Amino acid sequence: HSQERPTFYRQELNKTIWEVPERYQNLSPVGSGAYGSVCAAFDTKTGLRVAVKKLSRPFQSIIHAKRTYRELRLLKHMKHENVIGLLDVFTPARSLEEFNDVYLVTHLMGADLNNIVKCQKLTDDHVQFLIYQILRGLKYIHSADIIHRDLKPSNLAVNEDCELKILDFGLATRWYRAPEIMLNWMHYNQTVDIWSVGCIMAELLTGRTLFPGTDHIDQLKLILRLVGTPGAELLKKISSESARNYIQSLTQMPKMNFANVFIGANPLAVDLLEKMLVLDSDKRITAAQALAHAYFAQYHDPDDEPVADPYDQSFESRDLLIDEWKSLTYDEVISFVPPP
């Protein structure tokens, strides 16, 4: 109605003074790093357990300030059940002149896909549900012209109703990366993330990491052994002469028979894996196409797989001063409207 600034309180946490609205109670540290620090809390207003992140050094430099702005813009835009979103953002500052600290609030997440899966085979029905949610989230992320680029089990939050959210941080590190990402290709397709989904899905089905490379080259050797050496269609799109001549020099390997590799799996799962784990990124199934695949028939609802509002990322190409990034960040804090 009902206008005021909330009443704040102060408490010493993770070696600094935290100043938060009184709705957030029982702060308990959960982690600290270069980035800032996170406390778990109880939001008495919503009845939700939340995580409150206080950014470290948000405006220390142009690059810090642009990163802070980027993070707030992204979190503000992401409004989807299977993607991290923003419950609240606040500052104790009462003016731009006072503005120094940024706090971000989201649902408390205590378990990632590894924490829940624990290296065991999941049932096919359970794999359908988890992969469906990842693809549902990716459809939304991709529709905002965003590519995750490092999707992996540690970036997937899952609760005890195995409801899943895609994150861009963690609560082995390269095993799920697209081969073009490990070769610093640039010009990435959104299907870089589909490769990662194939890697994750394979592992949930078999209980084994698909490409557990020891290092960069080994990872690539494991990939080529499964999917085969590049065909002529792929080779004609490689602009680098050294890349082409190295690839041609490799002994021709056929794509393995996925039906035999994943013997025992639902043949629809095998079919989907064959469509995700394709070396040529142009020939990989998209998130929207994958959601329509027969494997997900029990979960697919074409009227409840939403896309994002257009996401203005023009700021990415701007070179601005610190105070400008800071003011733009301040604007976004003030304009925040919580979800219903």
Ligand SMILES: C[S@@](=O)c1ccc(-c2nc(-c3ccc(F)cc3)c(-c3ccncc3)[nH]2)cc1
């Ligand atoms: C860069 S790495 O050190 C790093 C690790 C974790 C985090 C990190 N950021 C958050 C986090 C918290 C609130 C937000 F609004 C947004 C992100 C969490 C979080 C969210 C929910 N439950 C538990 C923890 N973890 C950030 C950076």
Ligand SMILES: CCCCCCCCO[C@@H]1O[C@H](CO)[C@@H](O)[C@H](O)[C@H]1O
């Ligand atoms: C020997 C290992 C070869 C790896 C080949 C990876 C091929 C990835 O696929 C390529 O991705 C590019 C986007 O990044 C596109 O521009 C290309 O058209 C596409 O073919």
